[PDB]
């Protein structure tokens, strides 16, 4: 494992981790996706030519910051389109290892062991459909990336808030890691009134 | 001052009471530490962070951003068309 | 056991209680700083404002300016909703029978 | 000059809250400028609402606050200003109130010039009015709510209910002067949001 | 509240745990100190006192010895108080 | 079976003969002042000296009363140099009294014969110490000390005493015996020979 | 709502405190024992020994007492012979 | 500045005066046999008895040597009844040695007057303690016991001794002083008064 390889596996992950959730919750009509084989289970990806264009930047950029190890998190926020209030929040605490730059030694962990972990993480992601409340209102989503404060803000990008959910429940699921990056999830959802 | 501490027995009672008070103050502080602890970590998971350490970035142009624009527009188009159609109908007395 | 040994014991006890009190204080000193360096990283937090639910509860009038205003807003949205349908129905019936 | 009684302190502090809250509502544009009228209080010109509905609500809250002040059970008064649509907290004025529960076990009034208390209150109200020089224009339709922190062992009056703290995020803070009647001490501060 | 106090209780319980654990370790070490040291058969005056008869074979024997010493003393004086004068 | 009162009597009796044996064997009184008696399956020596008999009887009777009351912790025979007061030998009998026996409703199960067999072994060990204990080389006397619970009322002719410890000593530990109500341990501390 | 996952804790917390309390009083008793014995001169015979000078004021004074008593026995035995030999 | 060798001389000197004052104040020897001298800002009495002077110097001199080597752990002044050998009082001084002081690259920072003031307090506390101690009503002598590391080679004119415990004692922890290299704590155990 290298510092660039990890920066590819994890960056690639979110691409599938995001697509799936968008379907899991129904941010976009199922009739707008297209199943494709990956990892060890069948995943669903988008087919919209704008949604794909957006996710490309966020993941391409996420990847780039994965190499500099300046990335701390990635959050998928789901909010009411009219009101603007958040109802569901997905956070992935990204943990990097800056020493990976100072190696000489490709790291011992096998890529199969890594892929098996990644498979599990996705498992919960979809295994969390009969827990996670249903969105009885028109919602959208945004991608929030927590970074170091001295990091240079790329073109077309800008700082934002945490997009809190006022009264919510944080429910941890599982996680995984390569050698240089340890990603751990959980999903927070608005508390039923 | 302390030379007057020839009153060992009376002094011990005072030191005793001081021990008790210092014990109370200690426990109250320990729990306050808990509250601070619980709150801090129970919020860090909800998305909280350190301004001096963490910064939140995103795409100025994004799904939510766009969806917010074609809500705005629609309610503008709708308002307009009602006026437009209204006009046409008014034309024809 | 004697009245004499009592005086000696008192001197001894006071010295011991003095060492205890001094230990407890240097201990309160430690707690107080960590409590501060704790409430400190808390001031650096995005979210602000903390409360102890141990001795403090938060009250308000259930009927208040914000609650009344959020209501009216839904109420206004509902009227707007009911109007859109009314117009839609007039149109889809306007057109079904040639009025248009 | 006749000292400060417990009931007297509660009357003075309550009044400070009535006028301070009015000034905040007027200055932050929570209600239309024309719905306030000018009056003289503490030697200053202050704006107070003429809106019948607002008046009823403030009075209800102020009256209850005066009760809890007498009982020394109130710990804070917070003025929450939020985006009516998204519910986001945009501004939050927090007033820490320290009641001396011993002022009831007092034989005679406490010793503090009536003039000294008034000069202190005037100094805080003066600071509240001066915030117009740095607080941001609110660019969305907002409303406000008055939260009152109290002691846990307190019978919650009808018409009242428990609620969240409505904390603010990504805010800026400014602490104003405090004032005290030796019986009730009042700290004042404003947390607000600066346009990035 | 429930979830709040729950967070504080799991912290309070966890702290008491480390203490209980540390105390047992201390208690054990003190025990290893008491058993390892030289002073083993100590006297506890809060639970024990030692009694005897005020008049006993030893007090009687000591008194007899003093009286015999005196008697022998006086006799020695008498004898030399007779030899001197025969001159 | 044995009762609290029976146990106290059995133990007091052991002390009466044991103390006589120690006094004879250690030459604390001339041998011609003792006579032989058949006791404990053996032939034991007991004094004929009036003053000693009265003193021993006073101590043994009081011991018996304290044994019944379960407040005695030890009986110590202190042998000392008359002139200097130096302790030269010290027989220590640790005594454990079962305070619950006061609340017994039925005599305990241990037979009096098994108890007497244990006592005979101890008495025989006491007499066996004559082959090695050193001859006392100065005139000595003895005193009997009784360690008791702290709250015992001190009878008229009794008073508090120091423990009369011995220094530069060697010890011989003997077997214990028990009635199940009173357990008695025995040992003697004596001066290391010189030379 | 989980106001019970906090009720079980109010029980587990009182447990440790009740235990910690006993562990503390126990520790106290042990320390008091160790401290009194320390004040009495206790030590660990494997890491410490006690030395003194063979001839010291106490052994000297004791020796003189022994010589005073042997001198006393001596005079008595001698005087004894004289009186006997002299008729 | 305080050096290892200087700490040793200070401590040794303290013991010479401390021992002398205990002897005078407990009446071990006649007031008339001591002489007044000033030290540590106190008027102190020291023996004029030539034999005692010789014995004390022998011990203090050996103690200085062991203090320098950091192999001494206690000095105990044992007071006993000369006739009977009974131990009546034990004045104990624990000694804590900083074994790393041997590798110092410079004297330690502590004023000579600061140490003399701490010493003054140790000695006056002893004086203030005597007032409450049981009177010695018999003729006594004393011996100096030194606790050391078990592996210490024993000098000519020295031998192992037992600890001379007083188990039937009352005890009082008194004052301490430190030179930053040697710390001395004082305490006293004495026979529990009888009757």
């Amino acid at each position: 494992i290298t510092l660039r390889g990890s920066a590819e596996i994890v960056a690639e992950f979110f691409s599938f981790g995001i697509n799936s959730i968008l379907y899991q919750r129904g941010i976009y009509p199922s009739e707008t996706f297209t199943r494709v084989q990956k990892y060890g289970l069948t995943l669903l990806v988008t087919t919209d030519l704008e949604l794909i264009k957006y996710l490309n930047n966020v993941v391409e950029q996420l990847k780039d910051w994965l190499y500099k190890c300046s990335v701390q998190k990635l959050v998928v926020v789901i909010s009411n389109i009219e009101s603007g209030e958040v109802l569901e929040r997905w956070q992935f605490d990204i943990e990097c290892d800056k020493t990976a730059k100072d190696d000489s030694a490709p790291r011992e962990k096998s890529q199969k062991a890594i892929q098996d972990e990644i498979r599990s993480v996705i498992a919960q992601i979809t295994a969390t459909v009969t827990f996670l409340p249903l969105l009885e209102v028109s919602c959208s989503f945004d991608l929030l990336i927590y970074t170091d404060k001295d990091l240079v803000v790329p073109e077309k990008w800008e700082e934002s808030g945490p997009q809190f959910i006022t009264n919510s429940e944080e429910v941890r699921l599982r996680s995984f890691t390569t050698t240089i990056h340890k990603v751990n999830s959980m999903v927070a959802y608005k508390i039923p009134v | 001052a302390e030379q007057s501490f020839l009153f060992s027995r009376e002094e011990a009672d005072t030191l005793r009471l001081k021990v008790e008070e210092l014990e109370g103050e200690r426990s109250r502080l320990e729990e306050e530490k808990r509250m601070l602890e619980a709150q801090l970590e129970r919020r860090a998971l909800q998305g909280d962070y350190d301004q001096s350490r963490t910064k939140v970035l995103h795409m100025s142009l994004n799904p939510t951003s766009v969806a917010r624009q074609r809500l705005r527009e629609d309610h503008s188009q709708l308002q307009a068309e009602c006026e437009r159609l209204r006009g046409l109908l008014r034309a024809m007395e």
Side-chain angles (χ1 to χ4, degrees), chain A, chain B:
Chain A
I1 303 296
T2 47
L3 171 62
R4 185 197 302 171
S6 198
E8 181 65 4
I9 304 173
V10 183
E12 180 177 60
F13 163 62
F14 293 88
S15 177
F16 302 73
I18 293 175
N19 275 293
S20 47
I21 307 174
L22 294 178
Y23 188 89
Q24 303 294 301
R25 313 314 294 187
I27 305 307
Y28 293 68
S30 50
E31 50 191 299
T32 65
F33 296 65
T34 177
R35 291 169 291 172
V36 301
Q37 286 298 308
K38 206 67 179 66
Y39 300 162
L41 51 282
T42 54
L43 297 167
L44 297 68
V45 305
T46 66
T47 184
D48 288 297
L49 279 200
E50 196 54 55
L51 177 60
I52 189 171
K53 184 178 298 180
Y54 169 59
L55 293 183
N56 187 196
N57 300 69
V58 177
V59 174
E60 182 182 61
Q61 186 56 67
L62 175 55
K63 178 187 305 173
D64 183 297
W65 292 328
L66 286 166
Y67 190 68
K68 304 173 191 178
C69 297
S70 59
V71 61
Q72 292 175 45
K73 279 194 292 291
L74 179 296
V75 188
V76 188
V77 182
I78 307 305
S79 60
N80 179 314
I81 303 179
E82 281 69 4
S83 303
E85 82 168 61
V86 185
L87 301 177
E88 188 162 301
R89 205 166 175 293
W90 293 60
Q91 180 172 293
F92 303 61
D93 293 59
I94 295 178
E95 190 169 58
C96 315
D97 170 12
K98 301 167 180 291
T99 81
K101 309 186 172 182
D102 288 355
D103 289 352
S104 82
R107 312 203 174 181
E108 188 174 302
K109 190 160 186 173
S110 60
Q111 290 180 52
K112 181 179 175 175
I114 290 171
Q115 289 298 305
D116 287 325
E117 296 188 359
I118 291 179
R119 179 198 275 75
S120 312
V121 177
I122 300 180
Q124 294 287 183
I125 296 170
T126 306
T128 301
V129 192
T130 313
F131 166 115
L132 290 202
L134 306 174
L135 300 174
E136 45 202 297
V137 61
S138 199
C139 312
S140 182
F141 89 98
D142 187 8
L143 300 179
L144 311 178
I145 300 182
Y146 289 58
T147 61
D148 301 328
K149 229 296 180 184
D150 67 309
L151 190 71
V152 177
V153 182
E155 178 79 0
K156 304 181 178 305
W157 290 71
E158 70 176 298
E159 291 182 54
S160 67
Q163 282 292 68
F164 288 153
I165 301 181
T166 204
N167 310 307
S168 69
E169 300 186 67
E170 294 59 51
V171 175
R172 292 192 169 185
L173 308 192
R174 291 297 179 182
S175 61
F176 74 76
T177 170
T178 59
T179 324
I180 315 171
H181 301 70
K182 180 191 301 173
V183 184
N184 290 201
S185 276
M186 67 177 103
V187 59
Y189 61 87
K190 186 174 180 302
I191 293 179
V193 64
Chain B
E2 285 172 59
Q3 316 286 283
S4 335
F5 297 167
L6 216 53
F7 297 71
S8 276
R9 67 196 183 183
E10 303 82 340
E11 173 168 29
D13 298 314
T14 293
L15 289 174
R16 200 168 297 163
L17 295 184
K18 281 184 179 181
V19 169
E20 296 184 59
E21 301 179 296
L22 281 172
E23 285 183 354
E25 306 190 325
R26 175 209 268 166
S27 65
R28 186 184 299 168
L29 288 179
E30 298 174 308
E31 49 186 56
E32 297 185 321
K33 287 174 57 192
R34 296 169 200 146
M35 270 302 301
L36 295 178
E37 286 175 351
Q39 286 181 302
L40 290 179
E41 277 55 70
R42 167 168 172 174
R43 292 174 178 188
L45 297 183
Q46 302 183 318
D48 195 46
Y49 60 104
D50 185 314
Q51 322 293 73
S52 172
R53 284 294 184 171
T54 314
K55 174 208 296 186
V56 182
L57 305 180
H58 77 161
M59 293 271 269
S60 303
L61 43 162
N62 62 72
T64 298
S65 177
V66 185
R68 264 175 177 52
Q69 306 194 58
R70 22 218 293 259
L71 186 179
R72 299 191 178 160
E73 303 170 61
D74 281 41
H75 292 200
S76 287
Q77 294 175 58
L78 201 186
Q79 190 180 306
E81 284 180 44
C82 287
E83 178 53 52
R84 185 186 293 179
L85 176 45
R86 183 203 175 184
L88 299 183
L89 288 172
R90 193 58 180 286
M92 38 188 96
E93 182 179 359

